[PDB]
Amino acid sequence: DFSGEIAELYDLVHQGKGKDYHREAADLAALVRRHSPKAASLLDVACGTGMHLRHLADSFGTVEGLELSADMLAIARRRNPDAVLHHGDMRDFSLGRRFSAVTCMFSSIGHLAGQAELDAALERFAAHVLPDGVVVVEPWWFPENFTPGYVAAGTVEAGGTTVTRVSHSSREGEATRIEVHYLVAGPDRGITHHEESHRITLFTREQYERAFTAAGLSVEFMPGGPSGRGLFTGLPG
Amino acid sequence: DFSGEIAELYDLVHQGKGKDYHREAADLAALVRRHSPKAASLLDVACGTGMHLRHLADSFGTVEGLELSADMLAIARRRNPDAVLHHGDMRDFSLGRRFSAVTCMFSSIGHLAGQAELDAALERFAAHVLPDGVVVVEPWWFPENFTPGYVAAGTVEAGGTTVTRVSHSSREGEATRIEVHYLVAGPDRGITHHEESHRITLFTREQYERAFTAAGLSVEFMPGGPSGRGLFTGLPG
Ligand SMILES: Cc1cn([C@H]2C[C@H](O)[C@@H](COP(=O)(O)OP(=O)(O)Oc3ccccc3)O2)c(=O)[nH]c1=O
Ligand SMILES: Cc1cn([C@H]2C[C@H](O)[C@@H](COP(=O)(O)OP(=O)(O)Oc3ccccc3)O2)c(=O)[nH]c1=O
Ligand SMILES: Nc1ncnc2c1ncn2[C@@H]1O[C@H](CSCC[C@H](N)C(=O)O)[C@@H](O)[C@H]1O
Ligand SMILES: Nc1ncnc2c1ncn2[C@@H]1O[C@H](CSCC[C@H](N)C(=O)O)[C@@H](O)[C@H]1O
């Protein structure tokens, strides 16, 4: 989960890591318009703190979000006060309308547990996309590209708070176990320690392809992508 | 205390902070020889991991140490295998010989609790110095120069281990409370968290001067010094 301090620290952590949501959103908007020139709407699934949405709103007249963490969604709603952002689950939701694009960014799809959940999410994405539109999924690493033992450490400061974050990634069966620790310090705060752990599924490329195909989407993989993990696109029909 | 992982991390932490024990030792050796041209021996009290001693041994035919932490002293003895390094307490020890210089570096004197302990340590230092020699004490901050709320953060890597350290300093009556947290990570280790807390006494300049005088030493303060905290010297007579 992504609650409490995890959620409150998320944007600062990713700013310090140099994640450029503005450039990623401009790239996404152009990718959508490449397939759907008249595209006017976008649904960002697992939208987190709504960073992509805030920039995509400059480009699309209607942007909406779906997010299962209330604490992440609270930050997203503050950031996007004029947008409709829904609380719910990517495996089984129904908004009653379709969008030019359905996006699921930054490997959020890896929080699904196996093939049945992956297939269910892709079917929901196809159920919410228009016929000339596009479904965009940024996968987690494939098993052959996963680096067990990886350690990342960084420190960022803002507003008088210093945040140090360290992550460690290992292989646990068919998933990555990521452990993340934080030290959060400030002149009055003192030092507090926080920890979190995620299990992120190592779906193969073929497993993603199967989920897209079973949802009625034609699937393409582009290597590299916003995070080194590539990007899948899918078109209905 | 300075046991376990605190001791094992100490040198790497201070290397990453840029502490230059080689230059500090060359400066100390020249300071001693300025007062005692024929100086041939030095005792480093609260010698920690023996970094100063290792360099001072290149300059003085006899160097010895005194240290109360067995874990710090174990590292010092490995680093200085040909030197006699004593286990004991700066407030009350007796080596049965005197030295050209008695040094106490990097604010170790701030681990003493009040005037009686400070006076007792300075008397022991004077009891171990030769008549043309010098006692050198690097103080902690004086109250007027202490910065409450100070946060320091740094990360260093060596040998496959990543160490992040954060400290926070506050005023607690007549002492600084320093809280220190570490995250120590590696590909097999995973991530471990450690914490420590010290109370370091905020002696005034006059209190140091009184301790030197009561030990029979004439005292001089030089601002700046190896750590910004200045340096006291004292000469017998
Ligand atoms: C080059 C490289 C990295 N990784 C893995 C190793 C590690 O699992 C991840 C990089 O670690 P971190 O930078 O902390 O990850 P995020 O940016 O996603 O931050 C969060 C991670 C988890 C929860 C929340 C945020 O990619 C690989 O598997 N292969 C690679 O070639
Ligand atoms: C400029 C400045 C700093 N400090 C205080 C604030 C803080 O108490 C200290 C600087 O913090 P850190 O760099 O972690 O200290 P060390 O290098 O001694 O490492 C250890 C500290 C304690 C135990 C072990 C190691 O000096 C002041 O009081 N005045 C100042 O002008
Ligand atoms: N079943 C599910 N349904 C909806 N959101 C989910 C979910 N499982 C995980 N999430 C959300 O997936 C997100 C992963 S972090 C990625 C957030 C965002 N897309 C960004 O690029 O920053 C979290 O916000 C988490 O709460
Ligand atoms: N009463 C006492 N007697 C001897 N050593 C003491 C002591 N109280 C604290 N110490 C030692 O004081 C040291 C402080 S850290 C400074 C170590 C060393 N002089 C250096 O410059 O790196 C620790 O090694 C601690 O164990």
Coordinates of N, CA and C in Angstrom, one line a residue, chain A residues 41-111:
Chain A
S41 N -10.1 13.1 -24.6 CA -10.3 12.6 -23.3 C -9.3 11.5 -22.9
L42 N -8.9 11.4 -21.6 CA -7.9 10.5 -21.2 C -8.3 10.0 -19.8
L43 N -8.1 8.7 -19.5 CA -8.3 8.1 -18.2 C -6.9 7.6 -17.7
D44 N -6.4 8.1 -16.6 CA -5.1 7.6 -16.1 C -5.5 6.6 -14.9
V45 N -5.2 5.4 -15.1 CA -5.5 4.3 -14.1 C -4.3 4.1 -13.2
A46 N -4.5 4.0 -11.9 CA -3.4 4.0 -10.9 C -2.7 5.3 -11.0
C47 N -3.4 6.4 -11.0 CA -2.9 7.7 -11.2 C -2.0 8.2 -10.1
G48 N -2.0 7.6 -9.0 CA -1.1 8.0 -7.9 C -1.5 9.4 -7.4
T49 N -0.4 10.2 -7.3 CA -0.6 11.6 -6.9 C -1.0 12.6 -8.0
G50 N -1.4 12.0 -9.2 CA -2.0 12.9 -10.2 C -1.0 13.8 -10.9
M51 N 0.3 13.5 -10.9 CA 1.3 14.3 -11.6 C 1.2 14.3 -13.1
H52 N 1.0 13.1 -13.7 CA 0.8 13.0 -15.2 C -0.5 13.7 -15.5
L53 N -1.6 13.5 -14.7 CA -2.9 14.1 -15.1 C -2.8 15.6 -15.1
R54 N -2.1 16.2 -14.1 CA -2.0 17.7 -14.1 C -1.4 18.3 -15.4
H55 N -0.4 17.6 -15.9 CA 0.1 18.1 -17.2 C -0.8 17.7 -18.4
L56 N -1.4 16.5 -18.4 CA -2.3 16.0 -19.5 C -3.5 16.9 -19.6
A57 N -3.9 17.5 -18.5 CA -5.1 18.4 -18.5 C -4.8 19.7 -19.3
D58 N -3.5 20.0 -19.6 CA -3.3 21.2 -20.4 C -3.5 20.9 -21.9
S59 N -3.6 19.6 -22.2 CA -3.7 19.1 -23.6 C -5.0 18.5 -23.9
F60 N -5.7 17.9 -23.0 CA -7.0 17.2 -23.2 C -8.1 17.9 -22.4
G61 N -9.3 18.1 -23.1 CA -10.3 18.8 -22.4 C -10.9 18.0 -21.3
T62 N -10.9 16.7 -21.3 CA -11.4 15.8 -20.2 C -10.3 14.9 -19.8
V63 N -9.8 15.0 -18.5 CA -9.0 14.0 -18.0 C -9.6 13.5 -16.7
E64 N -9.6 12.2 -16.5 CA -10.1 11.5 -15.3 C -9.0 10.6 -14.8
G65 N -9.1 10.2 -13.5 CA -8.2 9.2 -12.9 C -8.9 8.1 -12.1
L66 N -8.2 7.0 -11.9 CA -8.7 6.0 -11.1 C -7.6 5.6 -10.1
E67 N -7.8 5.5 -8.8 CA -6.7 5.2 -7.9 C -7.3 4.4 -6.7
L68 N -6.6 3.4 -6.2 CA -7.2 2.6 -5.1 C -6.7 3.1 -3.7
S69 N -5.6 3.8 -3.7 CA -5.1 4.4 -2.4 C -5.8 5.7 -2.1
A70 N -6.6 5.8 -1.1 CA -7.3 7.0 -0.7 C -6.2 8.1 -0.4
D71 N -5.1 7.8 0.2 CA -4.1 8.8 0.5 C -3.4 9.4 -0.7
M72 N -3.1 8.5 -1.7 CA -2.6 9.0 -3.0 C -3.6 9.8 -3.7
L73 N -4.9 9.3 -3.7 CA -5.9 10.0 -4.4 C -6.2 11.4 -3.8
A74 N -6.1 11.5 -2.5 CA -6.3 12.8 -1.8 C -5.3 13.9 -2.4
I75 N -4.0 13.5 -2.6 CA -3.0 14.4 -3.1 C -3.4 14.7 -4.6
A76 N -3.8 13.7 -5.3 CA -4.2 13.9 -6.7 C -5.3 14.9 -6.9
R77 N -6.3 14.8 -6.0 CA -7.5 15.6 -6.1 C -7.1 17.1 -5.8
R78 N -6.2 17.3 -4.8 CA -5.8 18.6 -4.5 C -5.0 19.2 -5.7
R79 N -4.2 18.4 -6.4 CA -3.4 18.8 -7.5 C -4.3 19.1 -8.7
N80 N -5.4 18.4 -8.8 CA -6.3 18.5 -10.0 C -7.7 18.8 -9.5
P81 N -7.9 20.0 -9.0 CA -9.2 20.3 -8.3 C -10.4 20.3 -9.3
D82 N -10.2 20.5 -10.5 CA -11.3 20.6 -11.5 C -11.5 19.3 -12.3
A83 N -10.8 18.3 -11.9 CA -10.9 17.0 -12.6 C -11.7 16.0 -11.7
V84 N -12.4 15.1 -12.4 CA -13.1 14.0 -11.7 C -12.1 12.8 -11.5
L85 N -11.7 12.6 -10.3 CA -10.8 11.5 -10.0 C -11.5 10.5 -9.1
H86 N -11.6 9.2 -9.6 CA -12.4 8.2 -9.0 C -11.6 7.3 -8.1
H87 N -12.2 6.9 -7.0 CA -11.6 5.9 -6.1 C -12.1 4.5 -6.6
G88 N -11.1 3.6 -6.8 CA -11.5 2.3 -7.2 C -10.3 1.5 -7.7
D89 N -10.6 0.3 -8.2 CA -9.7 -0.8 -8.4 C -9.6 -1.1 -9.9
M90 N -8.3 -1.1 -10.4 CA -8.1 -1.3 -11.9 C -8.5 -2.7 -12.3
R91 N -8.7 -3.7 -11.4 CA -9.1 -5.0 -11.8 C -10.6 -5.0 -12.1
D92 N -11.4 -4.1 -11.6 CA -12.9 -4.2 -11.7 C -13.4 -2.9 -11.3
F93 N -13.6 -2.0 -12.3 CA -14.3 -0.7 -12.2 C -15.1 -0.5 -13.4
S94 N -16.1 0.4 -13.3 CA -16.9 0.8 -14.4 C -17.3 2.2 -14.3
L95 N -16.9 3.1 -15.3 CA -17.2 4.5 -15.2 C -18.4 4.9 -16.1
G96 N -18.8 4.0 -16.9 CA -20.0 4.2 -17.8 C -19.7 5.1 -19.0
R97 N -18.4 5.4 -19.3 CA -18.1 6.2 -20.5 C -16.7 5.7 -20.9
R98 N -16.3 6.0 -22.2 CA -15.1 5.7 -22.7 C -14.2 6.9 -23.0
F99 N -12.9 6.7 -23.2 CA -11.9 7.8 -23.3 C -11.0 7.5 -24.5
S100 N -10.4 8.6 -25.0 CA -9.5 8.5 -26.2 C -8.3 7.6 -25.8
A101 N -7.9 7.7 -24.6 CA -6.8 6.9 -24.1 C -7.0 6.4 -22.7
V102 N -6.5 5.2 -22.4 CA -6.5 4.7 -21.1 C -5.0 4.4 -20.8
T103 N -4.5 5.0 -19.8 CA -3.1 4.9 -19.5 C -2.8 4.3 -18.1
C104 N -1.7 3.5 -18.0 CA -1.4 3.0 -16.7 C 0.1 3.0 -16.6
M105 N 0.7 4.0 -15.9 CA 2.1 4.4 -15.9 C 2.9 3.9 -14.7
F106 N 4.2 3.9 -15.0 CA 5.2 3.7 -14.0 C 5.1 2.3 -13.3
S107 N 4.7 1.3 -14.0 CA 4.7 -0.1 -13.6 C 3.7 -0.4 -12.5
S108 N 2.7 0.4 -12.4 CA 1.6 0.1 -11.5 C 1.0 -1.2 -11.8
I109 N 1.0 -1.6 -13.1 CA 0.4 -2.9 -13.5 C 1.1 -4.1 -12.8
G110 N 2.3 -3.9 -12.3 CA 3.0 -4.9 -11.5 C 2.5 -5.2 -10.2
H111 N 1.6 -4.4 -9.7 CA 0.9 -4.7 -8.4 C -0.2 -5.8 -8.6

